Amino acid sequence: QGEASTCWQLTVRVLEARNLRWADLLSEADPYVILQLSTAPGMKFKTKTLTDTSHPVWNEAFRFLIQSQVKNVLELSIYDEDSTEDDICFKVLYDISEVLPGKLLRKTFSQEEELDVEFLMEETSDRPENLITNKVIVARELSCLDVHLDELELVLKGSYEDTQTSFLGTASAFRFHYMAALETELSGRLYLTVPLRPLTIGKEVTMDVPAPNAPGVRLQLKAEGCPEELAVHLGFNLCAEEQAFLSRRKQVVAKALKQALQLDRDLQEDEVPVVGIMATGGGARAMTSLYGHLLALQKLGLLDCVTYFSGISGSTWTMAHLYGDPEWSQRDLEGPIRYAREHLAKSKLEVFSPERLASYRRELELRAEQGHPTTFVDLWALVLESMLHGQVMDQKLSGQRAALERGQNPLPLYLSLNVKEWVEFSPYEVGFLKYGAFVPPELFGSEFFMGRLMRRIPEPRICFLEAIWSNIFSLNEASWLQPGTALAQAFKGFRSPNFLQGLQLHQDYEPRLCLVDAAYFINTSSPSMFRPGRRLDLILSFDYSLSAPFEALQQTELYCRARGLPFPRVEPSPQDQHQPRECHLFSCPEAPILLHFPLVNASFKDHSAPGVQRSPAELQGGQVDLTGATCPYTLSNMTYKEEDFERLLRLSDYNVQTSQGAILQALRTALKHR
Ligand SMILES: *[P@@](=O)(CCCCC/C=C/C/C=C/C/C=C/CCCCC)OC
Ligand SMILES: [Tb+3]
Ligand SMILES: [Tb+3]
Ligand SMILES: [Tb+3]
Ligand SMILES: [Tb+3]
Incomplete structure (x- = not known):
């Protein structure tokens, strides 16, 4: 440590x-x-x-x-x-x-x-400084200044609390936190100062502080090691809860594999293969297609073989709603599907009407009064919540541990691309994959210092996280220049550190409206699937791109290539790029098996179900507008006509079901890994 x-x-x-x-x-x-x-x-x-x-x-x-x-x-x-x-x-x-x-x-x-x-x-x-290091993050040694009392301004430069200013005169006290290695001074006034040499054993010290006109105040000072244990966990290993969950889950997987693979015997935990869902982003399109892919997996009795379930941006909308119900994976999915469809079809002229805008700015003022910055992303959280649901939705990422108590769902991993580093969110922990620095999700949002919790803040409603995960705005066609004006005008009258604050790095280690860097819109959630302790054996990669169905994967090849992580080479033939098909296999035979599912309208054109010719009455059901202008699945669009919703959902359901052979084939292969 x-x-x-x-x-x-x-x-x-x-x-x-x-x-x-x-x-x-x-x-x-x-x-x-x-x-x-x-x-x-x-x-x-x-x-x-x-x-x-x-x-x-x-x-x-x-x-x-x-x-x-x-x-x-x-x-x-x-x-x-x-x-x-x-x-x-x-x-x-x-x-x-x-x-x-x-x-x-x-x-x-x-x-x-x-x-x-x-x-x-x-x-x-x-004496040597006492660090707590991760070999890439370092927590410098701290120390703490207890100040006892018998318009006072105590100032200590270099300390998390810069200056403390109290008004009482009856038995008050104060703590300052600061590095031990700082050569600094405590300064008091009603400007006397006491030096603080670095790395020494602190003594007791009294100072009488002069009032300008009247009699003087006394102060007892001691410098000590800090009292607080590290709230942030520094490591490149999976947390206990995740480890516990892996067992809890692994059995229901063996129990579910046995029927799906009609197996000889029962499996020992050590032989159970680790299967992941790996969804990319893509707004409303990503969300509904994902529902469909999950539907397929449920029907085939295969969703119960999935240990981990990761997503970015739009995928997370699907994920967040489903995990609200703590046993979604066992219950009928067509309930949530209906929820999504209706809210997606509901016209969004209301969400920009001044009655709702009032309630946003009113929640931002309430939010600003509490210890909270006002960022654009927080507003995007409120409008997205308003589009995705009709109303405020009082759920929280911690709450999703409900969905995992008995290993009854896969572990949800919401990946987020920051200003660039990857931040993964699970109901167990949240943090930077690069720094092996993590906290439990309740504390996300709270104020930290040098890996210690300074002020606990109430865990935020999940929609604020969904905005982090699916943010589309910079720090600064005709359809949405008008809600922009409606908003801007309703909002007239109107710095944010993370839990790493204080921590340090180990040595040996024109104006725009939206985000534009390509990274934000073109990646799959690989990083989650390749975090240190996870050892994935099969990945079902769902891709919701309307062109370049293999870019996100090639990015991943690159990603794993640069970190010495085994990963099969994605080299699709010229024929595959031009007209891809429902499922693609890929495969250094210690590397995961990878079934990749493009968002393509291939055999679904003339099949209403796997292996069944399309009747001429349902021909229209197979025509899915995935290319050409006035395509309704553009990223921009967030109202999907109920008809259009269904096409894409069934296409997605179908594309997976119709690939049942390859999945089962892959699962067999994953079993003989060991
Ligand atoms: P993810 O898949 C997230 C994709 C989100 C796309 C949704 C687009 C919505 C348009 C609505 C915008 C609301 C307006 C906000 C205010 C802007 C103008 C202010 C003047 O990405 C990877
Ligand atoms: Tb000057
Ligand atoms: Tb001069
Ligand atoms: Tb000047
Ligand atoms: Tb750039």
């Missing part, structure tokens, strides 16, 4: 700059330098401010504590003192891995303008 490492002492000295651009109006520059260390977030150093020189010589020197095991980046920058805010003229980030100890380095930086600096890394005889 932990690691003891000694800090070094970096002594940087700022010598001179040369060729400093002037101020406007022929005035020469009044310059100074500022040093900030990436891994010392609250702290600044600042050189004297010289006057009217384009070749200024400060020759001052400052001191830091550098933890060798963390990635330390020094941002040093020259400003012109403006008598407004000061205009920057030179900035340069410098990784101080380069700088070796004992060896004195001189550097010159440039990006005309030149700045000369001298570093010296010196050993030191402080």
Whole structure:
């Protein structure tokens, strides 16, 4: 879990700059330098401010504590003192891995303008810092400042609580959290200050703080290790709950495989193959087709062989609604299908009417009053909730553990592409796959520090997560320039950290309206299926693209290729790209088996059910508008005429059912893996 490492002492000295651009109006520059260390977030150093020189010589020197095991980046920058805010003229980030100890380095930086600096890394005889590392994330050692009381402003630069300001005068107290390696000071006022040297055993300290006019206040100070246990779990292993669930699930899979594969005997847990559903995004189109694919899997008695179930964007809408009912996979799916169809067909002129807009901004004001940022994504959560359901829907990701108690459904993995890193959400845990940093979903949204929970916030209604998962907007045709105006005008009158806040990295490791980067709209949920502990043996890949039905998979090949993860090569023949078919097999024989299901209208044209010719009365049922203009399944569109909904759903149901042979074939093969 932990690691003891000694800090070094970096002594940087700022010598001179040369060729400093002037101020406007022929005035020469009044310059100074500022040093900030990436891994010392609250702290600044600042050189004297010289006057009217384009070749200024400060020759001052400052001191830091550098933890060798963390990635330390020094941002040093020259400003012109403006008598407004000061205009920057030179900035340069410098990784101080380069700088070796004992060896004195001189550097010159440039990006005309030149700045000369001298570093010296010196050993030191402080005790080693006590880290908690993941070999890619590091939690720096903390310490805590208990302050007892017998218009007070306590300030401690470098501390999660920057400045605390209390008003009572009858037995109050305060805690500050801050790194041990910070050289800093507590400052009190009604400006006396107490130094805080780094990495020492703290003593008791009293200070009398003068009132300006009246008698004085007393304060007891102790510095200690922190009391709080790490709320964030750092690791590249599956959590206990997931592990527990795997057993719980694996048996119902063997019980369900035996009938589907008409098997000789019962299976031991260690031989049960791990099968995953892997859905891509695609708005309303992805949602309804997915319902259909699930329907097929239920009818074939195969949905009960599925251990994991992952999705992105639209797929998650299907997923979230289904997991609301804690036993959806056992009950009739045509209930939820009907729900989806009706709400999809309901016209959405209401969702942008000022009665509803009121209730959004009213929930945003209520939301703003509580500890909450106002982001566009939070509004998108409210309108999406309003389209997807008629009303507020009071369900929560934690609540979906209901659906897993007895291994009665697969484990839902909602994947989310952030500003780029992948964030996976399960009812058990949520976090960054790249950093092996995870929390349980209740705490998602809460305020954190250095891997410790600082303020617990109420777990949010799932639609706010669905917006994260299916966000379509940047940080900034004729149909939807009008609700835009309706919204903007109703909303007139109107910074957000995550649970990683504080954590650090281990060393050895024109304006737009929507998102546009292709990553957001073209990937499958592979990352979830390839997380460290999961060992997937079969993947059913559902793809909801209307062109490029193999791009998302090739992305995955690439992804796994770059991480030394076994994965079969997706090389579809020229014929396959042009007119693909309902199911494609792929297959380093330790790599998962992969059945890929394009969104294609192939044999469904003239078959009403697997193996059955289409009657001329139902011919229209097989014609599905997946190409050509006025196709109703465009990503834009979020009202599907009940007729259109059905075509796509049945196509999807069919495409899977009609591929029953290959699935069963694949499952047999997965069994003989071991
Ligand atoms: P996922 O599959 C998510 C796809 C979502 C597409 C749905 C499109 C909806 C159009 C409605 C927009 C609401 C308007 C919001 C406000 C914008 C204008 C403000 C001035 O992606 C991978
Ligand atoms: Tb001047
Ligand atoms: Tb200034
Ligand atoms: Tb300016
Ligand atoms: Tb880009």
